[PDB]
């Protein structure tokens, strides 16, 4: 039978991205289902092995998937991961693209913490979006995991904590829908951008769509300009109209961080915790789904 690593049976393709395809797999040793990421060896962009190193650097952190095997086999670089549950985009669609405020706030608290953990390990993620957060399986079904480190990079030296240098004139990295304003402006990403993107993710969950989503264009050149033009022309107070002020406060705080500033993650969690209590919610892990 077809097995990567002599050990993982290849199953159906369950996802695609710029940095490889993802397949279901089965560990023949245990019958454990896994996720198998494949990257063609003849790729412009040797990346998967770097992503695997970052996963190894983050192992043991709460909400970080476990890497089971990496290696080269045939025409592919292979990374085998623990299989997680549905993504938040999956669950959003499952819930008919409506999440309650309670579910949004339960998710926000964990997502801020996942991003903080990555930053604590000296990396920025650079591709924060609903598809890249997955719920755990079974017992860990209440835990939000973060995936996809294919665009991640160090923002500071591990020993000296010297921050990487500021630059402009950069081409867009990440996804147009959730990228920070500064990314659209060509500015080097830093910690603040991961958190701004999360702010757009949270308003997406509240609204069902973002105002710069689904714009008519033709070229990809012109489409990203359309998005960058809309995102900038929509004030945060307009974006967040009809929702608690904490969401605007969150976004304004992220936009006000300087390039090398350390975010106050505890402040941002407490904005939403305070709202959670005001609403009378209990942190009982009853999500909408």
């Amino acid at each position: 039978e077809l097995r990567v690593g002599n050990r993982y049976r290849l199953g159906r393709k369950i996802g695609s991205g710029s940095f490889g395809d993802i397949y279901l797999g089965t560990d023949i040793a245990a019958g454990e289902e896994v996720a198998i990421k494949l990257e063609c060896v003849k790729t412009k962009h040797p990346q998967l092995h770097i992503e695997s190193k970052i996963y190894k650097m983050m192992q043991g952190g709460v909400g970080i998937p476990t890497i089971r095997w990496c290696g080269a086999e045939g025409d592919y670089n292979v990374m085998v991961m623990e299989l997680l549950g549905p993504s938040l985009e999956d669950l959003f669609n499952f819930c008919s693209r409506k999440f309650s405020l309670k579910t949004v706030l339960l998710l926000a608290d964990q997502m801020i913490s996942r991003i903080e953990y990555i930053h604590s390990k000296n990396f920025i993620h650079r591709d924060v979006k609903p598809d890249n957060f997955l719920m755990g399986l079974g017992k860990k079904g209440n835990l939000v995991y973060i995936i996809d480190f294919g665009l991640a990079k160090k923002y500071r030296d591990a020993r000296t904590h010297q921050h990487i240098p500021y630059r402009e004139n950069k081409n867009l990295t990440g996804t147009a829908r959730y990228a920070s304003i500064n990314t659209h402006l060509g500015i080097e990403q830093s910690r603040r951008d991961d958190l701004e993107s999360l702010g757009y993710v949270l308003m997406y969950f509240n609204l069902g769509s973002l105002p710069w989503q689904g714009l008519k264009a033709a070229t990809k050149r012109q489409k990203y300009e359309r998005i960058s033009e809309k995102k900038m022309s929509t004030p945060i107070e307009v974006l967040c109209k009809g929702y608690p002020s904490e969401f605007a406060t969150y976004l304004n705080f992220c936009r006000s961080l300087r390039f090398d500033d350390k975010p106050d993650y505890s402040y941002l969690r407490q904005l939403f915790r305070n709202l959670f209590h005001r609403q009378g919610f209990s942190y009982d892990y009853v999500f909408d789904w």
Partner: peptide, 7 residues
Amino acid sequence: SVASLTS
């Protein structure tokens, strides 16, 4: 608009 882009 949802494609992962590289620098």
